[PDB]
Amino acid sequence: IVGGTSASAGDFPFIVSISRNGGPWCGGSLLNANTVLTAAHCVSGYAQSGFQIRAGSLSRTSGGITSSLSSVRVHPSYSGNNNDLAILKLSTSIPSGGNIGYARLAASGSDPVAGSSATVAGWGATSEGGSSTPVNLLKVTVPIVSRATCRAQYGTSAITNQMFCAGVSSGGKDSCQGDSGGPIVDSSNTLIGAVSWGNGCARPNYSGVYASVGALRSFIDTYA
């Protein structure tokens, strides 16, 4: 997260950190006791044994409850930037309670409205290109950017109806490498997306791009 602030205990109770080969990798959202939602690009094409999820901690390295993966399912139309969600099944179920909870999902057919406030969180780099990643969770609030504006930034075909955008025109506030797969919520605390891609991080005139939960809800419901 670039331009963010420290998360407090009990913020984002459904967030999980996802390590790969024992090192930081990405974020995700706990949907229920045995299921995590993340970005497809976090897991597609990689050995599933490399991953571990941690829930219920501000730290990505310690505390909370961990699990390995039993299975991975990417959206059936995932390709590159598009349809960038996956469902992970956990080897060890994770109960809600304390600083662990489950996400509430945007509805099928919904789309975030331009200018509405969203909050994204993760353990990714705090500088575009940063050399070390924080141990403790960060968060930042950014407005939704209309899909038409985002298409003017990236190209018409580059932003699909399964993506939405968020950021500040002058830059400075964004998700970044290592934040992929983690949650972006709306002003009702409903999970509206997962961190997906962008041109650098927090650059003026290049919004962060998020995989849309509303657009991909049928896949999520099928496998959750």
* 62 noted as active-site residue: no
Of 19, 67, 180, 196, which one is the catalytic site residue? 180
* 111 noted as active-site residue: no
Q: In whole angstroms, what is the distance from residue 201 CA to residue 199 CA?
A: 6
Q: In whole angstroms, what is the distance from residue 141 CA to residue 82 CA?
A: 24
Q: Phi and psi (nearest 5°) for 25?
A: -145, -60
* 75 noted as active-site residue: no
Contacts of 222 (CB under 8 A, 6+ apart): none
Of 17, 84, 186, 207, which one is the catalytic site residue? 84
Q: In whole angstroms, what is the distance from residue 17 CA to residue 137 CA?
A: 9
Sign, CA torsion 111/128/122/89: positive
Of 41, 75, 174, 179, which one is the catalytic site residue? 41
Sign, CA torsion 60/36/219/21: positive
Q: Which positions are catalytic?
A: 41, 84, 180
